[PDB]
Design a protein around this ligand. Structure first.
Ligand SMILES: *CCC(=O)N1Cc2cccc(Nc3ccc(C(F)(F)F)cc3)c2C1
Length: 209
């Protein structure tokens, strides 16, 4: 009964993206994806969660405890290769599906050297479409820390230097049923930089113990 993409029978990720629209987008629209998961559309490889304890805040909110809460089958790792060739709008959009009408709490902890730099928490509430309930956290604004991190990171003269910094930069993302405090989806993000010719790309793992 193992996961075949990023979700559970109780909450699935439809689509995630982090993006910038340039100011000339009003003239003709364009967006650049830094990172992108689409599951609008085989079992998933696994990673032992102890291997990535150290990259994360290791106290309340942290990947150790949340796994100990369970359920373990809600836990994933996403390796992102971010695409970094591009006063615009810097945005994040998430979209989730469920069969339950729920109210989600959506936390994103940014940890830099495994250490919580910013936490953003939004709650979102269901809408009913084709039987499934749909949760849209669309066009949430990027944390200013990431926007300025991105501008610094892109100017590094060597891609191995970006991957050296990004080896210390992680994001933990926890989706909770607000009414029952009850964990649906935990996603740990680690990052490299992709190349010029390749765009954004990702690989999803199960997290196990
Ligand atoms: C604080 C901003 C926020 O809520 N985000 C949550 C989140 C989760 C995953 C990815 C991103 N965006 C992102 C990730 C990595 C890069 C970089 F290029 F540096 F690798 C840029 C953007 C967010 C933003």
């Amino acid at each position: 009964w193992q996961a075949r993409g990023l979700g559970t029978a109780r909450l699935q990720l439809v689509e995630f993206s982090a993006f910038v629209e340039p100011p000339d987008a009003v003239d003709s629209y364009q967006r650049h994806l830094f990172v992108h998961i689409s599951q609008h559309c085989p079992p998933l490889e696994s990673v032992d969660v102890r291997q990535i304890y150290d990259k994360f805040p290791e106290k309340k909110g942290g990947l150790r405890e949340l796994y100990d809460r369970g359920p373990p089958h809600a836990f994933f790792l996403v390796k992102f290769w971010a695409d970094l060739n591009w006063g615009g709008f810097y945005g994040v959009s998430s979209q989730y599906e469920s069969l339950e009408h729920m109210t989600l709490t959506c936390s994103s902890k940014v940890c830099s050297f495994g250490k919580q730099v910013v936490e953003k928490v939004e709650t979102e509430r269901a809408q009913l479409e084709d039987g499934r309930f749909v949760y849209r956290l669309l066009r949430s604004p990027m944390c200013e820390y990431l926007v300025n991190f991105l501008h610094k990171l892109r100017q590094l003269p060597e891609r191995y230097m970006m991957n050296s910094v990004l080896e210390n930069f992680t994001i933990l993302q926890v989706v909770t049923n607000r009414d029952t405090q009850e964990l649906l989806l935990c996603t740990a993000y680690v990052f490299e930089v992709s190349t010029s010719e390749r765009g954004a790309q990702h690989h999803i793992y199960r997290l196990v113990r």
